[PDB]
């Protein structure tokens, strides 16, 4: 709704919430000069 967006915001039910990755998210992470 606002800053940082929400509370549960940006955590996907089918992915982050179950610890599953989508088929291309690595690509993003790798560009940040390798993710967390």
């Amino acid at each position: 709704t606002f800053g940082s967006g929400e509370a549960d915001c940006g955590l996907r039910p089918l992915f982050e919430k179950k610890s599953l990755e989508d088929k291309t998210e690595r690509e993003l992470l790798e560009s940040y000069i390798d993710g967390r």
Binding site: T1, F2, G3, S4, G5, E6, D8, C9, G10, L11, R12, P13, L14, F15, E16, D22, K23, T24, E25, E27, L28, L29, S31, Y32, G35, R36
Partner: protein, 253 residues
Amino acid sequence: IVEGSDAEIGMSPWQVMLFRKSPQELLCGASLISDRWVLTAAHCLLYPPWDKNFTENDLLVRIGKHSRTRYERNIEKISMLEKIYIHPRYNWRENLDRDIALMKLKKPVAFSDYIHPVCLPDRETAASLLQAGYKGRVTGWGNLKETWGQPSVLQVVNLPIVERPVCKDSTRIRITDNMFCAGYKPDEGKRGDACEGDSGGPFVMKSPFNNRWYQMGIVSWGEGCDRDGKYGFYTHVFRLKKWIQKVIDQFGE
């Protein structure tokens, strides 16, 4: 989306479809920022040069979709608009500066496996991620080609943020600080872009600090689709956060 791929189910649960009541047509993309607020591009609603001036009653918002044309029974949710708000200083006369708009839903939508809000960036998140070379992600049901088709299912593409100078040297339009451009260089041998029907959609990034998805941009404008030497321009969400808070606090949330 040009040069994208089919999205996976539940991959962008904040993706919203802007839908014209009659004729029934896909207007634009949008994004779910809370249970009662949708974020989109001002030009999706108001654009005098083309005689475009949509109202609350003209549109429908469709959430949790995958399929572009099918009515997704028991999956998707359709909502009605209570109020539209356009940035007071949106510049449709010259360069689409401040191309941003908020839509308050008539009733709160319930979250589900296919329906979930995106985060809005904070100063530090923006600072850390909005860098040339970092990639973000665009989604939508727009055209597959500048002058083809149309996808059956939601498409997806990941694109790199470009250096402001390159952005400016690529066009004759005057670029503001309220914008950023993205896309591959002709050199890069990797393509993709938003296209007709993708406007208003999200440009998002995933924080490597907290694992959340943040919306950094709104699909705004571009000269053609996937043209060499050309880029896509996006509204800079963070630069406009203040206006967003304001509106949400003064009128609901």
